Amino acid sequence: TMYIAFILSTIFVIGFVGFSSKPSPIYGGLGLIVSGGVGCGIVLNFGGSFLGLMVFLIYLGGMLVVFGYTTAMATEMYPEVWVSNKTVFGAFVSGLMMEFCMVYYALKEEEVEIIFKFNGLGDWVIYDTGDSGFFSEEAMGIAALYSYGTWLVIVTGWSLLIGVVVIMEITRGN
Amino acid sequence: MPLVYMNIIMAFAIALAGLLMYRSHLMSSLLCLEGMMLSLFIMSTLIILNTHFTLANMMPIILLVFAACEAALGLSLLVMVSNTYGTDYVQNLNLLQC
Amino acid sequence: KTLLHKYSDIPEGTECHRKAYASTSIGGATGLIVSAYSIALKPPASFLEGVARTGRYTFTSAAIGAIFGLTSCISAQVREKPDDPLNYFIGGCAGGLTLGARTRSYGIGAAACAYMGLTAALVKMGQLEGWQVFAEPKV
Amino acid sequence: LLDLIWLETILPKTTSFIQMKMSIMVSNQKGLIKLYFLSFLITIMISMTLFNYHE
Amino acid sequence: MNPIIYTTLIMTVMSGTMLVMISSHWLLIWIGFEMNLLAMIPVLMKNFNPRATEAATKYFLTQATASMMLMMAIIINLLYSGQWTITKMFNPVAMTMMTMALAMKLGLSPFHFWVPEVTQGISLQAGLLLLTWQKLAPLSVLCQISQSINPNLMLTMAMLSILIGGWGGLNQTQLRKIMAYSSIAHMGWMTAVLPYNTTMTILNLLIYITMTLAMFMLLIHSSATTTLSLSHTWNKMPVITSLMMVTLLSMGGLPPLSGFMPKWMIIQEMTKNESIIMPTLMAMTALLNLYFYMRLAYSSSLTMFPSTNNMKMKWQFEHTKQMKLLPTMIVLSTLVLPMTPALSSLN
Amino acid sequence: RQWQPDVEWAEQFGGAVMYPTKETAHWKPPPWNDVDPPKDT
Amino acid sequence: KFYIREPPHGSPDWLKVGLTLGTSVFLWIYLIKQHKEDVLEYKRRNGLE
Amino acid sequence: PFFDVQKRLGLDLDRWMTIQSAEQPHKIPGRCHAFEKEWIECAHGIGGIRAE
Amino acid sequence: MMSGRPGRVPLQFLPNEARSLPPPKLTDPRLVYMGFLGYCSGLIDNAIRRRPVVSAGLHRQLLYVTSFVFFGYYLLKRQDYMYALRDHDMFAYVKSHPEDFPEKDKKTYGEILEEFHPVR
Amino acid sequence: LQYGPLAFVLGERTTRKLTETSKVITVDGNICSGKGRLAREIAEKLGLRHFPEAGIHYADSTTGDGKPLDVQLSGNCSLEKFYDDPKSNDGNSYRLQSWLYASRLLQYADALEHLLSTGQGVVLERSIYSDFVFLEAMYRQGFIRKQCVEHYNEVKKVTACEYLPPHVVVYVDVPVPEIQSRIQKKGNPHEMKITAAYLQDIENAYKKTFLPEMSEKCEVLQYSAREAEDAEKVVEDIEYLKCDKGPWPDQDDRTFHRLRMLVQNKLEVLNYTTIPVYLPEITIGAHQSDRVFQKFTELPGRKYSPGYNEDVGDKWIWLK
């Protein structure tokens, strides 16, 4: 129970290795949604309740769902399987071992310098000490989209309407 | 930096490598793009919650919606390519060499 | 840069074995990069064919580096002239001759002798006179 | 020997030949997304490695 | 497409570019790039052939990958500074990521492969938009963050762009691929002086956009996309081919034409910084671009290729539509060299 | 009269590339109207 | 007349001709007045007169 | 911005999310509010070169 | 260089401190070349549109000329103001930093020993 | 205000003009089959526009003053020369074949223009879709080189693809002996040299390529010479056709706008008829090209542009 965010992050990276080794896209999507679930859990452990539930509802139940639906239509006659290629196994194995080596090095050394400097002193350590009062600071920051973020709403809504128009232009096929 | 950040940035690097190293299917590359976006979302969320940048709490929402719009566009492109060739194989997208 | 630092800090016309090793390392690294790009953009028909192409490019470049280093350093220490661009010119021409041997063609060998010798002499001149390839902005 | 052959060979003919050869190497590409993005991975890795940029 | 929908998509492309150029916040700059790409993809597929679809797909893949890398650079910068303002980057690897992303968006040499194929695969109007308007946003970002770029990385990419644009364009008989390789070389010229003087980058961009607009409008006026099709244009409208020849000479940077101004100013500004070898290399390399420009001029205006019998039909007909601002674009692309000191207005 | 290009001179520029090698022997000039025929239905 | 079809540019576009002449005259008048007031503003800022 | 339309038109389009020491909802403080404020008040108006 | 200059208000083609410089003369050679550029644009417009290049659409060629001169006058003002600003800042910086710009001690060629190189 | 994006945006739609009799009808048949009578009475009684068959000087008729220009400046080919020496070394057979195909492309564009701009239907005598019958007939008789039919296929594929087929394909059926007797009846000495093998090849191309392939995208109406004189019966069968085949039913204003844009632009219509495919029968040398172009430019009203030719009675050049 002492370490929860680290198992979650290691599983996150494992799922990333799994779907980025690119088996047939249905198993890649399964790995992506496993990664998304554990990442939603990660941000739940950081106090990002609304953001993680957004991950769930819109990413895993929306965007993914649509991805798997579209894969179920444009696939191979025998939709492929993970095992069918030695390349998938090699990529997944290399990614898993580079995960294991670096997490072991960071755990037992705490001063790795792979591009960035890292210290696995813990993950609870960086949390600050204070009271947030009678509201969720995350929800207040996100609800400010309609009061502070007028410009953001304007450009995002315009881009979504343009996205509808754009999709209907491209898919017409003439 | 804490080791969760290490693993999140590592996930982004793995998604980038998986996208740059192609295979036959286009959908696999699009899923790698989606993984890159998801790792960006989690990194942004961790940074924003940790430093209590309250107004920046909305930034991950905007990132998610815009990247999903791009994903819809890419899915439509894949569907057009498949209707042309019956598959989403990138090796059929080579007739611009001449 | 450490690959180039180890070549640069050892003085000219001394410790010819060390300088030859450093130039061989530079050659092998450059040949590895060109092999990576060639394998990426013009893929082989098999893994072994790619390994063969990689080894061919790498040995050609490493042999050019080793020959340039040996000839440049030895002609520097033999003549006692470590600041003369002529030793680097001889090195570049010997590198061109071994590139011509690697491609087994006298025309490539002669043209490469001229071009690489002039290039190496220019490099020596730029080292002596502080020419900048990428000059940092100042004004 | 000099004007029609060697003075031609040294400066203009050999330079033109080199430019033509480089043009053939650069221009003739498979037109494959896969090879282009593999080369992109090579370039990205090189910029974050021996080519001292991120440091 | 519907004329209203096409106008809206064009306006959305320009508004994404403007969002990039008017924002102080990195998230809004990323939003502008996203909006530009979203609106740009349909205009590439306006004709809708498999070539157009493949061009759009390759464009989308490169631009989306670049955008994700740009967002990662922004997130690393925020991780180390907590700053969203577009200013110097506070992290070196974030700066490298951002530089590579912006170069991939621009199509610089190590990321140049998409430019020739996409330009060939789309129509001349789409290519005109692609090679003129799409350069503004990444270059403006680069000019804003220029004080923190690694000069070695940028200069490497610019020199490679010049070399590859020169060599790749040597082998082309397709006008769109020739335009794309010329664009790669000119982007290299723009980005070489970027570490030293962003005003020179803006000047070179304006001159290049003028020349590219003039050349693409002449091609659209001619309806020619191959060098042999252009070789018939003398027997229909020789004024177009003579104007095209002077424009190609301008593109080659021949004095006293307008295309010589950016090269001359950039060489001067570089020598001001003890940069002598690189400007000499760049000027020498541009002779390749001038060589295939001169090949096009030979086939188009300076000599007369065989025509066809069916060309007598076209003689009795005028153009239904007329290219806007083409005479102005032609005069600006050829005759403006005496006005060079006005470049200080860009300061 | 002045020499002007004939068909043999014009057809140097009508190929797929400007410098035909073996690796581009299979290259054909692209369609006139930029459209490729539909494949097997 | 001579042509079977009516030429689009067979008669002057009187609205466009008038607009062109008027906008040119306005541009010249505005330029001259701006230069006059600009010389005046320069002379009074610099104390010349 | 490349074209500072916001500072010419007096509009606040995106400057409100640009720092964590800007005004926040319910006056919730940034974690590094004082540190950012001190750095900004040091670096104000002397240019990036001097401020570095 | 000039982007972050103090007082530099956005999107302002001529700032109000430019009104202290002399406006360019009406017969300014650069302005006349601007008009010539407009005239060439009109001629080329006649050529491309397949009209008699010299005598067709005198209102259009005339408008080309006057619009080119109109833009050129303001371009000349902005260019001259930018160069005036450049000189202003250069002199201010030399004044504020006397140690960087010392008063060089002048000497005559009768006390300066220059090396003679024979041509022979 | 030429039909453009601004016209279509406000209120310019073509479906509000399209009707039940807004159809393009092509009448067809071998030589001396009498397509003229059938087409002309069909147009007159069905209230459509007739287009006489596209000749060498059709383009000269739709531009300038509508009068034919010299064969040197327009056409550069002859039909009498083809009937006298069909296997001549000039390449006049395929030069004529390409010129009249280009004239047919121009006429199809002009007819679709009238239909899409006014709403009235048109009737044509032959079209782009039945021009190949003569090309194959000439090929079987060994007139054109095999190189010269590949080029024809290229041009037809890249140009005719852009347009909508006829609603109705009326064909007049006459046997070869009767056609021969009609040619011998009208007395044209050049027509008198037409071999029965040529006419038989034309009829075979009609029956085995043209009529079957129209049958899947239009309704084909075949009459022999007996039922072709009763134009009432022909138009009665024209009015009884469902016309639920081909691309015409699935046409909306968006596609009609693009078709009107292409069809109104004559230089875009003829774009690919001058592809750089160098065949001796149609390639023009640079000296001859330049000379003939200058002589064309010297024509009255042809130098500058319509309305800018003072030498032909054009005023106000300096205000235009």
Ligand SMILES: Nc1nc2c(ncn2[C@@H]2O[C@H](COP(=O)(O)OP(=O)(O)OP(=O)(O)O)[C@@H](O)[C@H]2O)c(=O)[nH]1
């Ligand atoms: N070579 C050639 N000749 C053509 C072509 N189209 C029409 N002609 C000629 O056009 C001439 C005009 O006569 P036709 O239109 O065939 O027939 P007609 O005498 O009007 O009689 P009907 O067909 O009954 O109306 C004939 O000599 C045809 O051979 C073509 O594509 N190629």
Ligand SMILES: [Mg+2]
């Ligand atoms: Mg007929």
